[PDB]
């Protein structure tokens, strides 16, 4: 009860108006601060115990940031637009050794979001669903998080069908990009742990904290 897509859209609009890997990691550290502000604007998130808020954000930050820059890049040709105002071209990612994962982002996320014209409200809800991940280990009350997630997709479905009555399978199409987002997010973490291990690639404090155990 009470999870209006209007509040979710507002959260979205409130937070967003040489080694490409280094530039991407810097943009990620910058956006981690903005991610906290976004979450705080998602209905009921701030009312959950502090430890569960931490758990949810540590569990979903990478997928949450990937979803955001991917949607921001729908207008971009063959690349992504970073929050720092910088653009990373597919050729540049390839020349830095991260071409495979970069292409997965363009192919499975950006292109698909562009193909269906995913809007900001839909993106917001999908992110709110990722945020409210009931499977997150350590949760003091997973049922509570599960209930919030259900309220989000219930509101998302109503939004769809009311806004896109001509596309009965839109709601399902949106949810079905989540497994790709999960797989891509996991691969990105692997790369990040490697960069950290190797020593090259400066990693800022907030991004570094997210890579800390557990």
């Amino acid at each position: 009860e009470d999870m209006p897509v209007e509040r979710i859209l507002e959260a979205e609009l409130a937070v967003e108006p040489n080694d490409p890997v280094t530039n991407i990691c810097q943009a990620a550290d910058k956006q981690l601060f903005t991610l906290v502000e976004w979450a705080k604007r998602i209905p009921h998130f701030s009312e959950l115990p502090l430890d569960d808020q931490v758990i949810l954000l540590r569990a979903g930050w990478n997928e949450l940031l990937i979803a955001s820059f991917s949607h921001r890049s729908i207008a971009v040709k063959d690349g992504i637009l970073l929050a720092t105002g910088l653009h990373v071209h597919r050729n540049s990612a390839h020349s830095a050794g991260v071409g495979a994962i970069f292409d997965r982002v363009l192919t499975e996320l950006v292109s698909k979001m562009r193909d269906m014209q995913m809007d900001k409200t839909e993106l917001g809800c999908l992110r709110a669903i990722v945020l409210f991940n009931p499977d997150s280990k350590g949760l003091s009350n997973p049922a509570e998080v599960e209930a919030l997630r259900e309220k989000v997709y219930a509101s998302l479905e109503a939004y769809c069908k009311h806004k896109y009555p001509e596309q009965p399978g839109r709601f399902a199409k949106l949810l079905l990009r989540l497994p790709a987002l999960r797989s891509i997010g996991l691969k990105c973490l692997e790369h990040l742990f490697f960069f950290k291990l190797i020593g090259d690639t400066p990693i800022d404090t907030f991004l570094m904290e997210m890579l800390e155990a557990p």
Binding site: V36, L50, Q53, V54, L57, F206, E209, E212
Partner: peptide
């Protein structure tokens, strides 16, 4: 643990 995240969420 997780100094930054806790601080940012509390404020």
């Amino acid at each position: 643990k997780h100094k930054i995240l806790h601080r940012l969420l509390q404020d």
